[PDB]
Amino acid sequence: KRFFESYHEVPDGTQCHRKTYITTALGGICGIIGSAYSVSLNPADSTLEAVARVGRYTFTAAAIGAMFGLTTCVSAQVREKPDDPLNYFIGGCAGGLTLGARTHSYGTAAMGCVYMGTAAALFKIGKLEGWELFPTPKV
Amino acid sequence: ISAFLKNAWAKEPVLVVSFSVWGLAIIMPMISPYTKYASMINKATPYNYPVPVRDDGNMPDVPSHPQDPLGPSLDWLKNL
Amino acid sequence: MNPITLAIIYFTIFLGPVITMSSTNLMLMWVGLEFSLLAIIPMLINKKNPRSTEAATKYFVTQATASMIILLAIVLNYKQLGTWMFQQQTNGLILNMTLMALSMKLGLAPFHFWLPEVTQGIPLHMGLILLTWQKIAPLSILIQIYPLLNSTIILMLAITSIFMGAWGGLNQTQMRKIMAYSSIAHMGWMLAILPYNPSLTLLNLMIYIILTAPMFMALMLNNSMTINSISLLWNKTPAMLTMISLMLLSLGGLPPLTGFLPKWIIITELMKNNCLIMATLMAMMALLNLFFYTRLIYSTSLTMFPTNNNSKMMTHQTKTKPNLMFSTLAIMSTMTLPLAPQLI
Amino acid sequence: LREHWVHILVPAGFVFGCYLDRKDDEKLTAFRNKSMLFQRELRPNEEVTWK
Amino acid sequence: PFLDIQKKLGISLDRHFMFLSAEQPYKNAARCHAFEKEWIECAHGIGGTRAK
Amino acid sequence: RYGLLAAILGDKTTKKLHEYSRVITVDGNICSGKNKLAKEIAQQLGMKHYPEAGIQYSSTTTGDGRPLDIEFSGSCSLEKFYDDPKSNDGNSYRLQSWLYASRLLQYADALEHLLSTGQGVVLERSIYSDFVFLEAMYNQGYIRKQCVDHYNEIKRLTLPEYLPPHAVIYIDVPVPEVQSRIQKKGDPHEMKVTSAYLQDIENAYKKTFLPKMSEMCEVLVYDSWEAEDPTKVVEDIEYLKYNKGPWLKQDDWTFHYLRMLVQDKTEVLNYTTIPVYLPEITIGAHQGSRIYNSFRELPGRKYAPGYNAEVGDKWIWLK
Amino acid sequence: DGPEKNYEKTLAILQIESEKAELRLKEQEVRRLMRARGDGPWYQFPTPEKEFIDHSPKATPDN
Amino acid sequence: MMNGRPGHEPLKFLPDEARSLPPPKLNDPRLVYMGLLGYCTGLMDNMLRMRPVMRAGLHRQLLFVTSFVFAGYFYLKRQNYLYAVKDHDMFGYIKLHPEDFPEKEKKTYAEILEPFHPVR
Amino acid sequence: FYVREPVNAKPNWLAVGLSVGASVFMWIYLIQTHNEDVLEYKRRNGL
Amino acid sequence: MNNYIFVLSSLFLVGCLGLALKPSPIYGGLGLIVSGFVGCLMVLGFGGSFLGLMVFLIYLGGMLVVFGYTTAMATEEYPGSNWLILGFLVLGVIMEVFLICVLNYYDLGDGLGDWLMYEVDDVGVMLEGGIGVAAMYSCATWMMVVAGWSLFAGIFIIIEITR
Amino acid sequence: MPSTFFNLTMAFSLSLLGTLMFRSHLMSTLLCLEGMVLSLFIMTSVTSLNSNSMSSMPIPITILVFAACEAAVGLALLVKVSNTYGTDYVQNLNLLQ
Numbered sequence A: 001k002r003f004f005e006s007y008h009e010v011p012d013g014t015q016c017h018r019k020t021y022i023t024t025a026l027g028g029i030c031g032i033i034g035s036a037y038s039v040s041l042n043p044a045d046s047t048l049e050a051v052a053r054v055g056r057y058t059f060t061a062a063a064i065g066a067m068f069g070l071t072t073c074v075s076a077q078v079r080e081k082p083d084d085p086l087n088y089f090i091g092g093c094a095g096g097l098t099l100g101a102r103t104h105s106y107g108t109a110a111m112g113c114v115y116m117g118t119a120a121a122l123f124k125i126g127k128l129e130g131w132e133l134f135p136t137p138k139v
Numbered sequence B: 001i002s003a004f005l006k007n008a009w010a011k012e013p014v015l016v017v018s019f020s021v022w023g024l025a026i027i028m029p030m031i032s033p034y035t036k037y038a039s040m041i042n043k044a045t046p047y048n049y050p051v052p053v054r055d056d057g058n059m060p061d062v063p064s065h066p067q068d069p070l071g072p073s074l075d076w077l078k079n080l
Numbered sequence C: 001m002n003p004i005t006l007a008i009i010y011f012t013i014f015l016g017p018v019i020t021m022s023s024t025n026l027m028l029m030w031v032g033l034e035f036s037l038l039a040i041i042p043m044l045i046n047k048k049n050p051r052s053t054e055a056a057t058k059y060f061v062t063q064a065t066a067s068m069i070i071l072l073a074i075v076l077n078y079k080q081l082g083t084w085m086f087q088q089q090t091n092g093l094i095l096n097m098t099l100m101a102l103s104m105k106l107g108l109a110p111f112h113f114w115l116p117e118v119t120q121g122i123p124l125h126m127g128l129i130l131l132t133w134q135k136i137a138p139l140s141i142l143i144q145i146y147p148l149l150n151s152t153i154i155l156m157l158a159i160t161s162i163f164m165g166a167w168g169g170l171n172q173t174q175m176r177k178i179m180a181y182s183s184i185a186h187m188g189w190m191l192a193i194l195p196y197n198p199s200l201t202l203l204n205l206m207i208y209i210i211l212t213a214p215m216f217m218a219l220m221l222n223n224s225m226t227i228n229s230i231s232l233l234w235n236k237t238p239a240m241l242t243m244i245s246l247m248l249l250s251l252g253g254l255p256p257l258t259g260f261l262p263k264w265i266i267i268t269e270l271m272k273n274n275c276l277i278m279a280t281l282m283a284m285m286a287l288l289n290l291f292f293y294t295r296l297i298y299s300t301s302l303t304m305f306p307t308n309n310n311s312k313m314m315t316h317q318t319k320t321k322p323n324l325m326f327s328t329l330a331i332m333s334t335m336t337l338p339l340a341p342q343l344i
Numbered sequence D: 001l002r003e004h005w006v007h008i009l010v011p012a013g014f015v016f017g018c019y020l021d022r023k024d025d026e027k028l029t030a031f032r033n034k035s036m037l038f039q040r041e042l043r044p045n046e047e048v049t050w051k
Numbered sequence E: 001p002f003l004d005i006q007k008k009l010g011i012s013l014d015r016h017f018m019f020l021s022a023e024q025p026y027k028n029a030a031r032c033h034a035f036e037k038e039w040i041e042c043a044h045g046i047g048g049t050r051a052k
Numbered sequence F: 001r002y003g004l005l006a007a008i009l010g011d012k013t014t015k016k017l018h019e020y021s022r023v024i025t026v027d028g029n030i031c032s033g034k035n036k037l038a039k040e041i042a043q044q045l046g047m048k049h050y051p052e053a054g055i056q057y058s059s060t061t062t063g064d065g066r067p068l069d070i071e072f073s074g075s076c077s078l079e080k081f082y083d084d085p086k087s088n089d090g091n092s093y094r095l096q097s098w099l100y101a102s103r104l105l106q107y108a109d110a111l112e113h114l115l116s117t118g119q120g121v122v123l124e125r126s127i128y129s130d131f132v133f134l135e136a137m138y139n140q141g142y143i144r145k146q147c148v149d150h151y152n153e154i155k156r157l158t159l160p161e162y163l164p165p166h167a168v169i170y171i172d173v174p175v176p177e178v179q180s181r182i183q184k185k186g187d188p189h190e191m192k193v194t195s196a197y198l199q200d201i202e203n204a205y206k207k208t209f210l211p212k213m214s215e216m217c218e219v220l221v222y223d224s225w226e227a228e229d230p231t232k233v234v235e236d237i238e239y240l241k242y243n244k245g246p247w248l249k250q251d252d253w254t255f256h257y258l259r260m261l262v263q264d265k266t267e268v269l270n271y272t273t274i275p276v277y278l279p280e281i282t283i284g285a286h287q288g289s290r291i292y293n294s295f296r297e298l299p300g301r302k303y304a305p306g307y308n309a310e311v312g313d314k315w316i317w318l319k
Numbered sequence G: 001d002g003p004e005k006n007y008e009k010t011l012a013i014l015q016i017e018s019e020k021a022e023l024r025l026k027e028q029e030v031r032r033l034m035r036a037r038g039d040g041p042w043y044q045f046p047t048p049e050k051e052f053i054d055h056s057p058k059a060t061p062d063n
Numbered sequence H: 001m002m003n004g005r006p007g008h009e010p011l012k013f014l015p016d017e018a019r020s021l022p023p024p025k026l027n028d029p030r031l032v033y034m035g036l037l038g039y040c041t042g043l044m045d046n047m048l049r050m051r052p053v054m055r056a057g058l059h060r061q062l063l064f065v066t067s068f069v070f071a072g073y074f075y076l077k078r079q080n081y082l083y084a085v086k087d088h089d090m091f092g093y094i095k096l097h098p099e100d101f102p103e104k105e106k107k108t109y110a111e112i113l114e115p116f117h118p119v120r
Numbered sequence I: 001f002y003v004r005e006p007v008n009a010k011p012n013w014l015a016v017g018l019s020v021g022a023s024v025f026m027w028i029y030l031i032q033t034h035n036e037d038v039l040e041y042k043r044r045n046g047l
Numbered sequence J: 001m002n003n004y005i006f007v008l009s010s011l012f013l014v015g016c017l018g019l020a021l022k023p024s025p026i027y028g029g030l031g032l033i034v035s036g037f038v039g040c041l042m043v044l045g046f047g048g049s050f051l052g053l054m055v056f057l058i059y060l061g062g063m064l065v066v067f068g069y070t071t072a073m074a075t076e077e078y079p080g081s082n083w084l085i086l087g088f089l090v091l092g093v094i095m096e097v098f099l100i101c102v103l104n105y106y107d108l109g110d111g112l113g114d115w116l117m118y119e120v121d122d123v124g125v126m127l128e129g130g131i132g133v134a135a136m137y138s139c140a141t142w143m144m145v146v147a148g149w150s151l152f153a154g155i156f157i158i159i160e161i162t163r
Numbered sequence K: 001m002p003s004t005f006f007n008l009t010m011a012f013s014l015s016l017l018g019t020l021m022f023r024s025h026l027m028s029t030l031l032c033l034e035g036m037v038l039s040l041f042i043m044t045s046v047t048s049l050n051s052n053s054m055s056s057m058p059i060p061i062t063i064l065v066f067a068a069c070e071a072a073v074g075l076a077l078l079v080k081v082s083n084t085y086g087t088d089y090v091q092n093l094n095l096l097q
C-alpha cells in the first residue's frame, strides 16, 4: 500500500512513469473487482467466455487508468503548472475517452469525458484543499 | 368428573400414572419434614479448603480450634 | 394457525428482538437474533404458495450464515479478552465481522439481494414485520457497539446501500419490492451516522417505521402489490389518495414534510464531523429515490389511471376500514416537522 | 353568530395575529429603553418608553 | 444496553457472568482472575476513551 | 365483527353444522325450471334459497337494496346481450364479468350464512358453473380469445379460495325443448337465441362441468321428469352421502379464516378488479370518475352505513 | 408606536441570536474535546461492572 | 452521547431533577400544535372511513385532540429536560476545562484591517 | 334502512363512555400536573 | 504424542474441507460424523469429559444422524464423481500443508508443546466440566430458560412449517 | 492451543466458503452450515476449558441447542422444497427474480 500512496508523495507532473504505473494498477484492480461482480452475478456461458470478460473489463479499466495518469502528468509537464484541477480534468477527460472507445461509443465518451474528468479534478482540489474522506468521528 | 377417571384408569392406564407422578413429585418436596436438609447436607461438604480468618479478638463465635465446642457442629447430619 | 401456535410464534418474534436489546452478554444478544430467525420463518410460509417456500429458504440461509458469523465474532472475542462482549481493545477484524454479518441480517449494501426477493414473496403484512420489527434487533447490537466500529466500512455500506436502493427502485414496479428497496436505502442513512451519533440512527429508524407502517397498511387496504393496482385507488377508496401522496414524498426527503428531518439532521451531524464528501453524494442520489416515489405519485394520485367495470361492484360493498393506526401514524409522520427540535 | 360563523373566521385570525405580534414585543423588550440612540430618561408618570 | 430493562428491574440475569473474574462455580478462580480485576477496577468511573 | 376474539371465545362453526347444512347448487340450461326446484328443496330442509345472481343483485345486497341505475351497476344488459350478439361495445362480456362478480358476492354471502347461522345453502347456478356461458360465447363469435383468458384468470385467482359445492344438481332438458320453453315465456329477448349457442351451453356442462365436479362434489343428474318433482329430488339429496370432497378437512380453526374472508366482501372480489386492461372491462377515468362521483352521492351511500343522515341515520355525532 | 420600538426590538433579537450562535459553536468544541479526552460526562463508554468481580476467598492460593 | 452521564436513570422517563425546570405552559404553541395535529388525525380518520368528516365521532375528535395534547405536556416536559441537561453538562465543562475554552479579545475594527475589494 | 343493516346504526355506548370519560380523566390529570408542577418548580427554585 | 491436538486439528480441517467441496449429501455426512468424532476427541484432550462426550452424544448421533436420515428421505437423489472431489480433496490435504508450511518455516511451532492444559490444580476436586454446565441451575439460570423456549417453540415452529 | 485454534478457525472459514458457494443440492449447504456450528462449539469449548472459565461452559451447549432447532427449521424448509419441486436443487429457487 506504501506503493499507491507514492503517487501522491512526488509532486504532480513529475515522475510520470510512476504515476502512470500506479494509476494503471488501480484501474486494473478495479477491473478485476468489477469483472468479478460482473461474473458472479450475470454469469457467463462458458468459463472461457468469462475469462475473456474479466480480461476485457480489466484492460479497459487499466487503460482508463493509464491515460488518466499519463494525460494528467504530461498536461502538467507541458503546462508547467503542477497544481491545477485542470491538469486532472484533461486527464479525466482522456480517461473517459478511452472508456468511450473501448465501448465503441462517441456518446459515452461525451458523458465519460465530462463526468470522469470532473471527478478527477475534484480529487485534485480535494488533495489541494485537504478535504477529508471517510473521516474518523471527531464530533 | 370422578367417574370419567374410571374408564381412563381402565383404558389409557398410563397417562393417568404419568400425570399422577408428574405431580406427586412437586408436592412431596413442599410438604416433607426433611426437604430442608437437602440444601444443608449438600452445604456441609468441604470440597475446597476452609480458609482461616486472622484473629482480632473481636470474634467470640469463630471456633479457635477444630475441637472447640464452638462452630458449625452437625450432630444433625448424624442420625438425620 | 391454531391460535396457540400463533401466540408462541408471535411471542418469539417479539421476545426475539427484546432479549437482544435488553441483554449485555453478547451471547444472549445472539440467541435473541436466533429466535427472531426461527419465529419469522413459519409466518413467511403461511399461504405456502410455491413462491413462499423460495422466500423462506433464502431468508433462512442468508439469516443463518450471518447468525453463525456473529457467533464467531463473539467466540473470537472470548479468546482475545475473557469477556463475552466487545471492548475498546477488540481486534478490528473482530468488529468488522460483526458489521458485515449484522449488515447482512439487516440487509445493507452488497448484501441487499435477499431482502428484495423475500419482500416479494411474503404477504404485505409479514412484509412489514420483516422490514421493521426485524431491523430493530440487529441495529440494537450495532448501536451498542458504535464506539468501536469502523467509520470507513459503515460509510461504504451506507453509500452503497443508498445507491443500490435507489437504482433498484427505479426499475421495480412491484410495490413490495419498491418498499424493500426503499428500506435498503433508509437503512443506509441510518448506518451512516451510527459511528458519529447513534441517537440519530434511532430517529432515522422511528421515522422510517412511522412512515413505512402507514404506507404498507395502505398498500394492503386494497391489497395492491402493483402500481397499476394502487393507481385504481381513486375508485376503490378515494380519501387515502391524499395521504398516500404525502407519505411517499415524506419517505423521500422533500422539505415541508416530516421526512426531511432525518436526512437534514444526519447531514448536519456528518458536516459537523466533516464528511462533506460522503454526505453530499448521499443527499444527491437520495434525490433519485424521490423520482420513483413521484412516478408512483403520478400513477396513484396526480393522474387517474383507467379502471375495470367490476370496480363499481367493490365500491358498492362497504369497504372494511383501515385501522386507526393508519391515521395516527400518517399524520404524526406527514407533518410533525414543525416539532423537530424536541424529536432530536 | 349563526350562518356567519364562516365570515368571522378570517377576521378573527387578524385579531389573534395582532395579539401575538404585540405579544412578541413583550418578549423582545430587553434594551427596552436601554438603546444608545434612544435612551431618554423616563418622563414623569410614564411607565416605559415603548410598549 | 439499548434498553436496560435489567438494571431497572434490578434483575441480573445477564451480568453475573460476563468476565473471567465473575463468580466461578465452587469458587474455582480462573486463570487471570488477578489481572482482569486489576484491569476493571481501574476502568471503573473512567470511561472507555480513557480506559484505553 | 367476527374475529379471533370471537373464535377464541366460543363461536365455532363446527358446532353449528348439521346434516342439512350443505352448499347445494342446481344448474341447468337457460330454462330448466331450476328456480322451482331450488325453492322447493329449500322449503324441504329450510335451506336459505338464494336467487340466481342478477345485474343489481349486489345493489339489493348493499344499503337500501333498491335496484341501481344500469350505469351504476356496470352498464350490463342480458337483454342487449341477446338482441346484439358480438356487439361493438362488448356488453355481452361486461354482462358476463359482472355476472361472475355477482355470484362471487352471492356465493360468499351464502358461505357467511352457512358458517354463522349453520343453515345449508341453495344458490342455483354457481361460479363453478358460470364458465359454460363463456365457453359457448367463445364457441360462437360472442367473445374473442383474450376475453376468455381474462375471465379464466379472474376465476383461477378467486374461485379456489372458496370451498366447493357439497353436491350439484343437474336439471337437464334437451336443446329443442328449452327453446320451446323459451318460446312461451313472454320476453322477446330470450326468444330468437341461437339453438347452436344453447347447444354449446349444455354441451359445455356435460363435457366439462359435471365430470369435473363429479369428484369435487356429489353430482346428482336429474332428467326433466325427475324434476318438477321436488319431493323425489329432495329425497335423493337427503340420500347421498356427503363424503368425497375437499370439505372433509375443514376444521374449526380452518373455517375461521374462510369465514373472515366471506365476512369481507371487499376482499371476496378483490381479484375481480385486477388491473388487466382488456377494452370491454375498462371503466375509463373520465366516465369512471363521473359514475363513481355519481354513485357515491346516492342517499345513504355518501358515507358509510350508519352515518348518512339522508336515509334517517342518527347519532352520527357520537358514533 | 415608533422608531424606538423596532430599533430596541432588533437589538434584542440580535442579542438572542448572537448568544445562541456563540453557544452552538462552543458546543462543537466541547463535544470535540470530551469525545477524544473522555474526561467529561458525555462520551463515557462502558466497561464491565466492578460489582460483578469476586474478591472472595477463592479455592486456590494466589487467586 | 448524553447517556453514560453520572447519575443516569437507567430506564426512567424524566428524572425528578426535571422538577427544577419550569413546567411547559399548557398553551405553549407546541402543545397547541400537537392539538391541531391531533384534531387532524381525527378528521382524517373520519375521512378514510367515509364518515361525515367533521360532524362525526365528536367523542373521538375529543379523544384525539386530548390524547395528543396529553402526550405533549409530558413529552415536552422531558425533551425540555434533556435540553436543560445539555447545558448543565456543556457549560460545566467549559469551566472545569477552562484553558481549552479561553475568552478571546476582539480588536475594535479601528485596529483590525479587513481588506477592501472594490466593486467598480 | 339497509337490506344488510349497518353495524354502527345505534352508537356503541361503551365506546362513547371510554372515549369521553377517558379524555376527561386525561385533562383532570393534565391540568392537575401543571399547577402541581408549577408549585414544585416555584418551591424547588426561589419561587 | 505432544502433537496430540495438532494432528487432530489437521484432521478436523480435512473433514471441513470435505464438507466444503460439498460432496454427495450423505457421503459427506460421514465427513461431519468424522470431524465430530475428531472434535469430540480434542475436547477430551483438555479434560472436558462431559462437554466432549456431549458432542459425541448430540451432534454426532442426534443431529447428524437425523440429517442423513432426511437425506435418504429426500435430497439423496444421488443422481461430479465424489472421486473427483476426493481428487481435489487430496489436493487440499496437502494444499493446507502449504498454508501451514509458510508459517511452519516462519514459526509457536515444532508440533505442540505446553499449549494445552495451561493451568490445572495439582490438588483439588470439583474441578471438572459439567460442574460449569450445571450452572444452568445455579447462577446461570437464564441460558437454561431461553434454551427451553428454543426447543419448546421449536416444536411449534416445525409443525407449522410442516403443515 | 494457539496453533490449534487456528485450524478450527480456518475450518470455519473453509465451511464459510462452502456455504457461500452453492452447488446443486441444498442439503449440502445445510450440512455445511452445521460444520460451522461444530467448529464454533469446539472452539468455544476449547478456550473455556483452557481458561478454566467454568462459568461459561453453559454457552458451549446453548450454542448447540439453538443451532439444532435452527437446523430443524432449515430442514423443514428443505422438505417443503422437495415437496413443491421434488428435486431439492438450489437451481429451481428462482421464481422471485
Ligand SMILES: CCCCCCCCCCCCCCCCCC(=O)OC[C@H](COP(=O)(O)OCCN)OC(=O)CCCCCCCCCCCCCCCCC
Pocket: C238, C239, C241, C242, C245, C246, C256, C301, C302, F293, H047
Ligand atoms: C407546506 C405545504 C405542503 C403542501 C400543502 C398543499 C398540498 C396538500 C397535499 C395534496 C396532495 C394530494 C394532491 C392530489 C389530491 C387529489 C384529491 C382528489 O382527487 O379528490 C378526492 C379526495 C377524496 O375525496 P372525498 O373527500 O372522499 O370526497 C370526494 C370524492 N370525489 O378529495 C380529498 O382528498 C379532499 C381532502 C384533500 C386534502 C385537503 C388538503 C388541503 C390543502 C392542505 C394545505 C396545507 C397548507 C399548510 C401550509 C403550512 C405553512 C407553514
Ligand SMILES: Nc1ncnc2c1ncn2[C@@H]1O[C@H](COP(=O)(O)OP(=O)(O)O)[C@@H](O)[C@H]1O
Pocket: F029, F030, F031, F032, F033, F034, F035, F036, F052, F078, F081, F095, F096, F099, F124, F130, F133, F134, F190
Ligand atoms: N353468465 C351468463 N351469461 C349470460 N346469461 C346468463 C348468464 N347466467 C345466467 N344467464 C341468464 O339467465 C337466464 C336463465 O334464468 P331463468 O332460468 O329464467 O331464471 P329462473 O331460475 O328464475 O327460471 C338465461 O336466459 C341466461 O341468459
